[PDB]
Design an enzyme around this catalytic site. Structure first.
Site, mmCIF file in Angstrom:
data_model
loop_
_atom_site.group_PDB
_atom_site.id
_atom_site.type_symbol
_atom_site.label_atom_id
_atom_site.label_comp_id
_atom_site.label_asym_id
_atom_site.label_seq_id
_atom_site.Cartn_x
_atom_site.Cartn_y
_atom_site.Cartn_z
ATOM 1 N N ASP A 256 -112.845 13.651 25.883
ATOM 2 C CA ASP A 256 -114.060 14.421 25.685
ATOM 3 C C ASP A 256 -115.284 13.574 26.033
ATOM 4 O O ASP A 256 -115.204 12.351 26.183
ATOM 5 C CB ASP A 256 -114.140 14.911 24.238
ATOM 6 C CG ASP A 256 -115.048 16.114 24.074
ATOM 7 O OD1 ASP A 256 -115.690 16.516 25.064
ATOM 8 O OD2 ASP A 256 -115.112 16.660 22.952
HETATM 9 C C1 LIG Z 1 -127.379 8.973 8.390
HETATM 10 C C2 LIG Z 1 -128.691 9.485 8.980
HETATM 11 C C3 LIG Z 1 -128.703 11.000 9.137
HETATM 12 C C4 LIG Z 1 -127.986 11.419 10.415
HETATM 13 C C5 LIG Z 1 -127.552 12.881 10.394
HETATM 14 C C6 LIG Z 1 -126.877 13.277 11.703
HETATM 15 C C7 LIG Z 1 -126.814 14.791 11.888
HETATM 16 C C8 LIG Z 1 -125.481 15.374 11.427
HETATM 17 C C9 LIG Z 1 -125.412 16.883 11.648
HETATM 18 C C10 LIG Z 1 -124.872 17.234 13.031
HETATM 19 C C11 LIG Z 1 -125.008 18.719 13.351
HETATM 20 C C12 LIG Z 1 -124.714 19.005 14.821
HETATM 21 O O1 LIG Z 1 -123.830 18.438 15.369
HETATM 22 S S1 LIG Z 1 -125.712 20.213 15.735
HETATM 23 C C13 LIG Z 1 -124.623 21.140 16.851
HETATM 24 C C14 LIG Z 1 -125.331 21.365 18.183
HETATM 25 N N1 LIG Z 1 -124.588 22.301 19.006
HETATM 26 C C15 LIG Z 1 -123.307 21.924 19.578
HETATM 27 O O2 LIG Z 1 -122.852 20.849 19.384
HETATM 28 C C16 LIG Z 1 -122.539 22.916 20.444
HETATM 29 C C17 LIG Z 1 -122.590 22.709 21.954
HETATM 30 N N2 LIG Z 1 -122.342 21.318 22.291
HETATM 31 C C18 LIG Z 1 -121.689 21.008 23.547
HETATM 32 O O3 LIG Z 1 -121.385 21.897 24.270
HETATM 33 C C19 LIG Z 1 -121.407 19.562 23.961
HETATM 34 O O4 LIG Z 1 -121.254 19.527 25.352
HETATM 35 C C20 LIG Z 1 -120.140 19.010 23.301
HETATM 36 C C21 LIG Z 1 -118.997 20.010 23.451
HETATM 37 C C22 LIG Z 1 -120.398 18.748 21.819
HETATM 38 C C23 LIG Z 1 -119.737 17.698 23.974
HETATM 39 O O5 LIG Z 1 -119.870 17.845 25.359
HETATM 40 P P1 LIG Z 1 -118.771 17.123 26.353
HETATM 41 O O6 LIG Z 1 -117.554 18.008 26.469
HETATM 42 O O7 LIG Z 1 -119.375 16.941 27.723
HETATM 43 O O8 LIG Z 1 -118.378 15.771 25.804
#
Ligand SMILES: CCCCCCCCCCCC(=O)SCCNC(=O)CCNC(=O)[C@H](O)C(C)(C)COP(=O)(O)O
Ligand SMILES: CCCCCCCCCCCCCCCCCC(=O)OC[C@H](COP(=O)([O-])OCC(O)COP(=O)([O-])OC[C@@H](COC(=O)CCCCCCCCCCCCCCCCC)OC(=O)CCCCCCCCCCCCCCCCC)OC(=O)CCCCCCCCCCCCCCCCC
Ligand SMILES: CCCCCCCCCCCCCCCCC[C@@H](O)O[C@H](CO[C@H](O)CCCCCCCCCCCCCCC)COP(=O)(O)OCC[N+](C)(C)C
Ligand SMILES: CCCCCCCC/C=C\CCCCCCCC(=O)OC[C@H](COP(=O)(O)OCCN)OC(=O)CCCCCCC/C=C\CCCCCCCC
Ligand SMILES: CCCCCCCC/C=C\CCCCCCCC(=O)O[C@H](COC(=O)CCCCCCC/C=C/CCCCCCCC)COP(=O)(O)OCCN
Lengths: 459, 124, 178, 128, 104, 88, 219, 70, 55, 84, 175, 63
Positions: free
Chosen positions: F43
């Site tokens: 991935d």
């Molecule tokens: C400790 C300090 C605080 C930190 C907090 C951190 C935040 C935690 C909460 C996280 C919430 C989320 O993930 S927010 C979610 C945002 N939306 C998505 O993730 C859906 C679409 N993402 C994709 O399509 C990408 O391409 C993907 C398949 C992921 C990879 O791609 P690859 O296939 O090219 O590798």
């Protein structure tokens, strides 16, 4: 005294009749000889003075200024050697003639037993300086600069003339010795208020006092290198020397009338030192530094204590040497980059290490690092002001902080950091430039061994 | 600490003031009032030039200690006995100061009780 | 540094940058390796809970509260590598990087030492002198009308050619010249 | 739910929390392309002038010259006496002078009075 | 200029400026040597509140400790010769009022 | 410093060593030219994990714009080589 | 004013130190807290005692800084305590030198910091001082002990956290000799200088058993 | 200055017996010094004079008269 | 006479000799740090004597 | 003369999670249905000379044994020399 | 040493206690003093004796200048310039003499403090009284003149002070 | 050998110069070098006079 006056006059036929390629060599060697001969003026008395004759006399206030004036000319020749190379031989000889005329007029100014002769020469130094600024200047604005340097100066000095003459018609003589011995108090009157203003404002405009200072940045910025050196080093000291000379007749009105100028200078130093922090030009920064130091000298002269006069003399000589060195440094950068902007060329310490150490020494001296005579002057003036009023210390200390700040800003912006990528014409420093800076700095650190020679007649 | 808590939390006047000590005549306790004796005279203490805060009633032991340290120099562990005597005299001075503080405290208690009893008698 | 930036960051690029920053600050928070591994697998699982997500309005609604959750727990003193733009040794060796052209000002006595290096340097200078006349024309031909759209440069397409504007990339001073 | 970040002048909002950046629009997309276009064109000009083997000077930068000219020489001709300018000039150029005049006059009047009444204890004050 | 991208290939890496772009009017005030307006891990107003609260609390408590001094149950230290009159100030020709120290 | 002068052979050995310790990749199929997304079926996130592992292994951090265009072990080897100026 | 300023400085700076990650920053805040303690000593009218504290702080703080520098150079120019793990056995001489230095700085009895800091605390306790400054001095003592503990724990006890290429080496006579000279200093100089110089302050002879040991208890 | 020691790559680095003996010896002398001082002079920490109890003093030495005399 | 003054000044004075020699040929070689360290060691050893005199 | 002798890497098989606190994290992750792909990579921090750890108080008492032996022998010597 | 005078710079007899060591063990200070003497004082003294014999080979003199007494500003005509000039020069020389007197008293005071050590507050009271007397006298005589001081201004200050003193005395006598 | 020549050229020569300057020039001028008077304790003998200072007042010596 004529043993100093005559050889400088003889310099003119010497440089005019010399070879096309040996004007610089002859001028340098013989100017250095005149400096050595004028060094005899340093031996003074604790008594009144050494009286050469009816017309020329010297004092331990005139001695250091005269020595510095005579010592400057070789360095001005060394500095103006470079950019005049493509000039015709006749015009180079005209340049040298202007410099020699300026030296000669200043020499007769600083002895000048009588006030009218002093005035004539003090205003005669106007023409060579104006021609030098307006003819051998680079930018368009030089012409504009010239006008300011003229009229401002004349705007201050034309009433003084009248004042001086009026004095001769009531006292009977302007000879300095008699005026010293036959002094009488000035009663509080409108007539006396205006006489005091006419006598002082002529020299205030040349220091220059804050508010009347606008001609200085333009004149220093647009002038050629030698013009900048002579303006910063000696020509500014004419006002302080003149105030020291003329405040012997203005008592006790000075205690009452010093307030507008003491407030202007005390606040003015803060404002100009602050302006130095935010500047896009090197020469403008150094010009405003000169404005600040001369405001401090003005305060010292108006305080009128023996410590004030000692510190003022020391600061005048020390700042003359420091400002000459700094203007030379900025000019060495300007000849390589042709831009005269602080931000433009950076990280020069890696490319020119010895120029970097010269920058360090010059900025340290300007910063008033002990035990250099800059600090002697600053400390004596601060002490006298504190005796005057306990609250001046906040303003003096604020100025000290700001001057340290902007001097180190000027050092770090140009010398430290990463070099400019696209500038590749930065040749190694010549022997002439390093000799220039060394001859600037060695007298400073040597005079710090014998401060008595520059502390004035009240030592 | 306890005296601090007692003074800043209890009655302010009930406990003495360390700035105004003593507030009572020294003869109030008893008429004998024997006097403290200083051994070191002015000249040998000034010639000793100890210090202006070390010129207390325990100065003679300090002079003996300094004589010791000057004489037996190369070894700095030579004499602890003179140091012990000086430290003991300093402790005795400090205990006399505590006795004075507690004496003024208890005398103030006495004066408060006496005034209260007399005022109560005047009340009846 | 090496690569020319693009006009914008698509949603995937923002996802990956947020993921990397969150992982770095998580490692800074959990000093010990085992604890960091535990919480990193936990964070990856919480990050891929909505991997397969389809619509884009809800996707951009996420990675917006994610930004706030990150900015609330971001450890105001994170670990930074020594040579990084925050590190304790960021530009430390920058005062020793001297431009190559300075060597052209060496006195002939200085150039007498190291003769072989200056032979090779002269060869490099001639190489650049010819390759520049080739590179100017390669760029004027290869450039679309109206100026370039991205700060990307093309490679060399012939035999004797060299990449356009190569002199100041191959002649970097060093990583630690002194 | 988390406590929020309030930007200030000296604490600017981050890019990651700028609301506008997240909400992309068609007009905005076109605009970004043109910004990168002008930036890349300037970079290409600088690199063409930069890699030249013939050039042995400084690449004159019109933006720096414009900055310096605007900061130094371009102030007065665009100056206009406006209530804002007049009030600011009067305050910042006259108020300090008269405030310090008042302070120093007060101090020196007090000190001269103390001298005249003789209650200053100026003993040992030999240098002045 | 602190918050500009530090990984870009700038023409002036130290200045973080590209050749040609318009220069901020106040560039000489943001040069990474001076005021930086970066985002901060805590809001600015929260910073000011916490710092001023700490300062004012400390000043008030230092005044309180001044008004409620600590000491030990001890009377004043006693000095032998009229509270050491001759070697503090001197004036040996006045015969100071005799103070005599109580032995307890 | 007194640091050893590491070479390309050391670089590639360390790259392949770090990638072998990744349990998600069989050590027999990953070779110096094994692409990440297609030959290994990893991935994008796991590419970011690989990049961070190489960061922590080599002590310097790769800008994400340069990192996200690192898809082959030889590409990473060459990137680290060019950053740290190795001859042979 | 001197007493109040020293108290606030030492408290605030020790509090800032308690949670730092750069080793050099931790020891910098340590020395700033020590300077605040010295200013407190001046404020309570004990200048000679403050000079003795200057003399002892020189030795042990300088050798703490030298040990930290050895660690920094050993781990390829690294300063964050989050990236040094088990260095108790990896570099024994640096470990023992910094342990002796931490014990001395924290006023472990019969070390170089004992004869100065202990007397500082005894003198402030029995003097007519501000209550708040007394409280802050004691709290600063406790926090000094705490951030010393932080340095030891985060730099030497746990499992290693540094990059795999280990370059840890101490086999150099220069570093060893420079450390061991200051180690001998920070062990014996306190006794030597304290017992050699003539006495300049009246000693604090009598003292409650609990306020006697309050330094040891709080540390 | 010292000897030639090689990096070891993910194992405990090579240590000479010399530095180990030096570290052990200096720790030993530090502790020996502490206990030598504590045995020979324990008064520095524990004190060596007693603190008087002010409530134990009887009023005869404090000049306290029984509520009636003066 | 009274070696205290002579030693207390000579320690400071020999502290400046390497600065005098900074323009010599030793500066351009690698023996300068050894030179400065040896000078400081000598200066400390020499300054020990006035401390003994005072004690 | 520098450290150029062609140093050799270990074998990547030698790193095992067995005997390390990565069993605890692995068990807690599987107890939720997750695995740590990099758990083997940190194995070298718990494998070799780094296996044995020392407590903080065990750190303070680096040389208590030799110090105590020397102290007791010194007390014995002074007891036998003074009581003569 | 006869190089200066022992009465303008008085010194106490410098009483020093003879060493009375109470310890059998030898000190390093006496050995250090002995080696310092034989290693430094002897070569220094030999070089000085060579230099002194060379000086005594070529002996010659220099003198101190004497200045006569001239009318002061109180015997100066209002507009006469020669006698006013002479009086001004004499007043300047008296000014410098007064400064050097104050410098002598200050040197005495500083030496008194440094020598007395920790008892300076008592033993140096006489020097303090001398310095206060001279300081008071100097202040009335030369202070508050200004940078452009002169004989006429000093005389005017003195006249004003004597007017005030006469007024105060006349008022006090007749009250 | 190196340390011998070092100590000769760097310690012996400067100390010779300073010892000369102090013992013949600096001390030639009055009050240039002022020494704190050495401490005086009872029973000591003075080299100049030979007078033996009286002892103390025989304080009570218990414990
Ligand atoms: C400790 C300090 C605080 C930190 C907090 C951190 C935040 C935690 C909460 C996280 C919430 C989320 O993930 S927010 C979610 C945002 N939306 C998505 O993730 C859906 C679409 N993402 C994709 O399509 C990408 O391409 C993907 C398949 C992921 C990879 O791609 P690859 O296939 O090219 O590798
Ligand atoms: C005091 C102890 C020293 C005694 C020994 C005598 C030293 C002789 C110095 C003579 C005067 C200096 C000449 C000016 C230019 C120097 C030429 C040069 O570029 O050097 C190249 C030369 C060769 O090296 P290089 O390979 O070419 O390097 C080229 C690169 O540029 C690399 O360049 P760089 O990185 O090496 O930078 C150059 C370096 C050195 O270059 C300089 O910057 C020199 C200028 C420093 C002073 C700046 C002005 C500030 C006010 C000071 C005024 C005091 C002067 C006293 C009388 C002076 C007599 C001439 O800069 C500095 O070191 C920083 C200076 C900051 C000084 C801080 C405090 C100074 C005052 C301290 C107290 C002084 C009085 C004490 C009184 C009471 C105690 C007794 O290097 C040197 O020779 C260095 C000189 C030694 C440093 C002296 C600094 C302090 C001494 C000041 C005056 C001497 C006092 C004598 C007291 C004796 C008792
Ligand atoms: C060991 C040395 C220590 C001291 C060093 C002293 C250095 C001497 C030179 C430096 C002094 C500068 C000259 C300052 C005084 C000259 C001006 C005037 O005051 O002196 C003149 C006289 O001075 C001399 O005649 C001329 C001085 C010239 C000094 C030049 C020396 C160096 C020149 C080197 C030239 C290089 C050679 C060629 C190279 C190509 C006029 O005085 P005069 O009215 O008469 O005598 C009256 C005395 N009476 C009435 C009592 C009888
Ligand atoms: C009175 C002070 C007046 C204010 C001074 C104005 C100075 C203006 C020009 C300063 C030059 C600008 C400058 O130096 O750049 C800012 C530069 C960079 O900031 P960093 O935190 O180091 O960032 C590093 C992380 N990347 O910071 C500075 O150096 C400037 C610091 C200014 C501090 C001024 C405030 C101090 C106030 C102290 C009051 C206490 C007075 C004394 C108290 C004791 C009384 C008993
Ligand atoms: C860079 C610009 C600086 C400008 C410098 C000029 C400003 C100086 C102030 C005015 C100068 C002219 C004053 C006259 C010269 C002195 C003459 C004198 O002292 O004689 C007076 C004569 O007094 C005058 O003539 C004064 C007339 C003034 C006319 C011009 C006024 C200009 C404005 C002055 C007010 C502002 C003051 C500050 C000037 C600010 C300039 C920027 C005595 O008169 P008697 O006849 O002798 O009386 C005896 C019988 N009862």
């Amino acid at each position: 005294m004529l043993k100093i006056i005559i050889p400088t006059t003889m310099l003119l036929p010497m440089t005019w009749m010399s070879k096309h390629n040996m004007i610089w060599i002859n001028a340098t060697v013989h100017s250095l000889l005149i400096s050595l001969i004028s060094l005899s003026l340093l031996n003074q008395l604790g008594e009144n003075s050494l009286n050469f004759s009816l017309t020329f006399f010297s004092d331990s206030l005139s001695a250091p200024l005269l020595v510095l004036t005579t010592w400057l000319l070789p360095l001005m020749l060394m500095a103006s050697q470079s950019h005049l190379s493509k000039e015709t031989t006749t015009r180079k000889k005209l340049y040298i003639t202007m410099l020699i005329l300026l030296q000669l007029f200043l020499i007769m100014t600083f002895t000048a037993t009588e006030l009218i002769l002093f005035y004539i020469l003090f205003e005669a130094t106007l023409v060579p300086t104006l021609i030098i600024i307006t003819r051998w200047g680079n930018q368009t604005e030089r012409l504009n600069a010239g006008l300011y340097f003229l009229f401002y100066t004349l705007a201050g000095s034309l009433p003084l003339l009248v004042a001086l003459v009026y004095i001769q018609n009531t006292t009977g003589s302007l000879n300095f010795l008699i005026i010293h011995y036959w002094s009488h108090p000035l009663s509080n009157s409108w007539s006396n208020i205006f006489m005091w203003l006419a006598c002082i404002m002529a020299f205030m405009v040349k220091m220059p006092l804050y508010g009347l200072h606008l001609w200085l940045p333009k004149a220093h910025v647009e002038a050629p290198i030698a013009g900048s050196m002579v303006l910063a080093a000696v020509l500014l000291k004419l006002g302080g020397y003149g105030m020291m000379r003329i405040t012997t007749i203005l008592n006790p009105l000075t205690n009452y009338m010093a307030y507008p100028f003491l407030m202007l200078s005390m606040w003015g130093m803060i404002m100009t030192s602050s302006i130095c922090l935010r500047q896009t030009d090197l020469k403008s920064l150094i010009a405003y530094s000169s404005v600040s130091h001369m405001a401090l000298v003005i305060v010292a002269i108006m305080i009128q204590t023996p410590w004030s006069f000692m510190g003022a003399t020391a600061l005048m000589i020390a700042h003359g040497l420091t400002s000459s060195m700094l203007f030379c440094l900025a000019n060495t950068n300007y000849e390589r980059v042709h831009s005269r902007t602080m931000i433009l060329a950076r990280g020069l310490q890696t490319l020119l290490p010895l120029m970097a150490t010269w920058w360090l020494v010059a900025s340290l001296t300007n910063l008033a690092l002990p035990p250099s005579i800059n600090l002697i002057g600053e400390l004596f003036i601060i002490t006298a002001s504190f005796s005057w009023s306990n609250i001046t210390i906040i303003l003096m200390g604020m100025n000290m902080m700001i001057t340290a700040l902007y001097s180190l800003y000027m050092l770090i912006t140009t010398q430290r950091g990463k070099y400019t990528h696209h500038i590749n014409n930065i040749k190694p420093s010549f022997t002439r430039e390093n000799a220039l800076m060394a001859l600037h700095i060695l007298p400073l650190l040597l005079l710090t061994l014998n401060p008595k020679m520059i502390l004035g007649p009240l030592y | 600490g306890a005296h601090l808590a007692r003074r800043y939390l209890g009655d302010a006047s009930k406990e003495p003031d360390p700035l105004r000590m003593p507030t009572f005549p020294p003869d109030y306790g008893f008429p004998e009032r024997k006097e403290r004796e200083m051994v070191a005279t002015q000249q040998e203490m000034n010639d000793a030039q100890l210090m202006l805060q070390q010129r207390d009633y325990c100065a003679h032991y300090l002079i003996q200690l300094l004589k010791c340290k000057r004489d037996s120099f190369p070894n700095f562990l030579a004499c602890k006995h003179e140091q012990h005597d000086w430290d003991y005299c300093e402790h005795l001075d400090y205990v006399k100061r505590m006795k004075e503080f507690e004496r003024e405290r208890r005398l103030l208690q006495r004066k408060k009780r006496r005034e209260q009893r007399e005022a109560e008698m005047a009340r009846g | 540094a090496f690569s020319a930036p693009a006009a914008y960051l698509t949603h995937q690029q923002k996802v990956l940058r947020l993921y990397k920053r969150a992982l770095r600050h998580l490692e800074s928070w959990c000093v010990h390796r085992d604890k960091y591994r535990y919480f990193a697998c936990l964070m990856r699982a919480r990050f891929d809970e909505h991997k397969n997500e389809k619509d884009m309005v809800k996707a951009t609604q996420l990675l917006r509260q994610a930004e706030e959750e990150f900015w609330y727990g971001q450890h105001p003193q994170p670990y930074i590598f020594p040579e990084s733009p925050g590190g304790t040794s960021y530009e430390r060796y920058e005062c020793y990087k001297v431009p190559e052209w300075c060597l052209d000002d060496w006195h002939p006595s200085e150039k007498a030492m190291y003769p072989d290096y200056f032979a090779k340097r002269e060869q490099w200078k001639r190489l650049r002198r010819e390759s520049w006349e080739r590179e100017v024309k390669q760029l004027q031909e290869e450039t679309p009308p109206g100026g370039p759209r991205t700060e990307a440069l093309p490679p060399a397409r012939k035999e004797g050619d060299l990449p356009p504007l190569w002199w100041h990339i191959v002649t970097r001073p060093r990583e630690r010249p002194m | 739910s988390f406590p929020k970040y309030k930007p200030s002048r000296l604490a600017t909002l981050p890019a990651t929390l700028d609301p506008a950046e997240y909400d992309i629009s068609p007009e905005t997309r076109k605009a970004q392309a043109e910004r990168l276009a002008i930036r890349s064109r300037l970079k290409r000009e600088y690199l063409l002038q930069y890699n030249d083997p013939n050039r042995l000077g400084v690449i004159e930068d019109p933006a720096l010259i414009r900055w310096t000219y605007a900061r130094s020489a371009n102030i007065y001709p665009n100056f206009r006496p406006t209530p804002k300018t007049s009030l600011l000039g009067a305050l910042f150029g006259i108020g300090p002078l008269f405030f310090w005049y008042y302070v120093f006059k007060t101090d020196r009047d007090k000190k001269e009075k103390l001298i005249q009444e003789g209650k200053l204890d100026q003993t040992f004050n030999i240098s002045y | 200029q602190q918050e500009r991208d530090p990984w870009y290939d700038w023409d002036h890496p130290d200045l973080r400026l590209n050749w040609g772009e318009p220069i901020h009017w106040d560039l000489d005030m943001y040069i990474r040597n001076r005021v930086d307006t970066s985002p901060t891990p805590v809001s600015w107003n929260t910073m000011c509140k916490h710092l001023f609260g700490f300062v004012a609390f400390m000043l008030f408590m230092f005044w309180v400790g001044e008004i409620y001094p600590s000491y030990q149950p001890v009377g004043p230290k006693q000095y032998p010769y009229n509270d050491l009159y001759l070697e503090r100030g001197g004036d040996p020709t006045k015969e100071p009022e005799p103070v005599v120290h109580y032995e307890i | 410093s007194d640091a050893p002068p590491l070479t390309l052979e050391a670089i590639k050995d360390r790259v392949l060593y770090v990638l072998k310790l990744y349990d998600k990749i069989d050590p027999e199929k990953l070779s110096v030219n094994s692409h990440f997304m297609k030959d290994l079926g990893l991935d994008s996130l796991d590419q970011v994990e690989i990049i961070m592992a190489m960061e922590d292994e080599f002590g310097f951090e790769i800008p994400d714009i340069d990192a996200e265009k690192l898809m082959c072990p030889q590409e990473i080897v060459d990137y680290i080589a060019d950053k740290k100026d190795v001859y042979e | 004013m001197t007493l109040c300023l020293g108290a606030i400085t030492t408290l605030f700076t020790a509090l800032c130190a308690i949670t730092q990650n750069d080793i050099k920053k931790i020891v910098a805040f340590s020395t700033s807290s020590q300077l605040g303690l010295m200013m407190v000593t001046i404020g309570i009218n004990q200048p000679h005692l403050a000079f003795l504290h200057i003399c002892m702080h020189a030795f042990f703080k300088a050798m703490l800084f030298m040990c930290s520098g050895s660690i920094i150079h050993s781990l390829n120019d690294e300063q964050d305590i989050r990236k040094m793990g088990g260095l108790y056995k990896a570099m024994p001489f640096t470990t023992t030198a910094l342990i002796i230095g931490s014990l001395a700085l924290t006023g472990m009895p019969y070390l170089t910091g004992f004869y100065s800091k202990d007397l500082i605390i005894e003198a402030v306790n029995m003097s007519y001082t501000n209550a708040w400054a007394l409280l802050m001095t004691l709290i600063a003592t406790s926090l000094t002990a705490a951030y010393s503990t932080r340095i030891i724990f985060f730099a030497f006890l746990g499992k290693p956290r540094f990059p795999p290429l280990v370059l840890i080496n101490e086999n150099n006579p220069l570093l060893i000799n420079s450390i061991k000279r200051l180690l001998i200093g920070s062990i014996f100089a306190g006794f030597i200088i304290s017992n050699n110089i003539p006495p300049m302050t009246v000693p604090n002879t009598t003292m409650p058993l609990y306020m006697k040991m309050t330094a040891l208890i709080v540390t | 200055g010292g000897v030639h020691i090689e990096p070891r790559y993910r194992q405990f680095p090579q240590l000479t017996r010399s530095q180990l003996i030096q570290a052990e010896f200096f720790s030993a002398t530090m502790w020996f010094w502490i206990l030598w001082r504590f045995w020979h002079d324990s008064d520095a920490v524990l004190g060596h004079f007693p603190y008087p109890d002010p409530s134990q003093w009887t009023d005869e030495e404090l000049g306290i008269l029984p509520d009636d005399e003066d | 006479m009274n070696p205290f003054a002579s030693l207390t000044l000579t320690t400071l004075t020999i502290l400046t000799i390497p600065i005098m020699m900074s323009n010599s040929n030793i500066y351009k070689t690698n023996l300068y740090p050894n030179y400065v360290k040896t000078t400081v060691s000598y200066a400390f050893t020499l300054s020990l004597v006035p401390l003994l005199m005072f004690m | 003369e520098h450290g150029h002798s062609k140093m050799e890497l270990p074998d990547y098989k030698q790193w095992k999670i067995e005997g390390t606190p990565l069993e605890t994290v692995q068990e807690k992750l599987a107890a939720r249905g997750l695995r740590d792909p990099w758990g083997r990579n940190e194995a070298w921090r718990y494998s070799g000379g780094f296996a044995n750890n020392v407590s903080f108080v065990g750190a303070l008492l680096k040389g208590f044994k030799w110090g105590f032996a020397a102290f007791v022998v010194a007390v014995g010597a002074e007891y036998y020399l003074e009581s003569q | 040493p006869d190089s200066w005078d022992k009465d303008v710079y008085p010194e106490p007899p410098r009483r020093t206690p003879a060493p009375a060591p109470q310890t059998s063990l030898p000190n390093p200070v006496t050995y250090l003093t002995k080696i310092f003497d034989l290693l430094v004082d002897r070569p220094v003294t030999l070089a000085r004796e060579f230099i002194e014999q060379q000086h005594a080979k070529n002996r010659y003199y220099y003198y101190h200048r004497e200045f006569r007494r001239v009318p002061d500003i109180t015997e100066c005509e209002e507009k006469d310039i020669l006698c006013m000039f002479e009086a001004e020069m004499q007043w300047r020389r008296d000014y410098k003499v007064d400064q050097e007197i104050v410098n002598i008293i200050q040197e005495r005071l500083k030496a008194c403090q440094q020598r007395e050590g920790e008892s300076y507050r008592q033993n140096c009271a006489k020097e303090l009284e001398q310095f206060t007397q001279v300081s008071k006298a100097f202040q009335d005589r030369y202070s508050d003149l200004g940078a452009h001081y002169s004989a006429r201004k000093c005389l005017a200050k003195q006249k004003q002070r004597m007017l005030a003193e006469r007024k105060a005395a006349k008022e006090a006598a007749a009250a | 050998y190196r340390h011998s020549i070092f100590a000769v050229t760097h310690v012996l020569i400067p100390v010779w110069i300073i010892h000369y300057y102090l013992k013949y020039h600096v001390t030639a001028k009055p009050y240039t070098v002022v020494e704190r008077k050495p401490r005086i304790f009872p029973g000591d003998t003075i080299l100049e006079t030979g007078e033996v200072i009286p002892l103390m007042k025989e304080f009570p010596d218990q414990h």
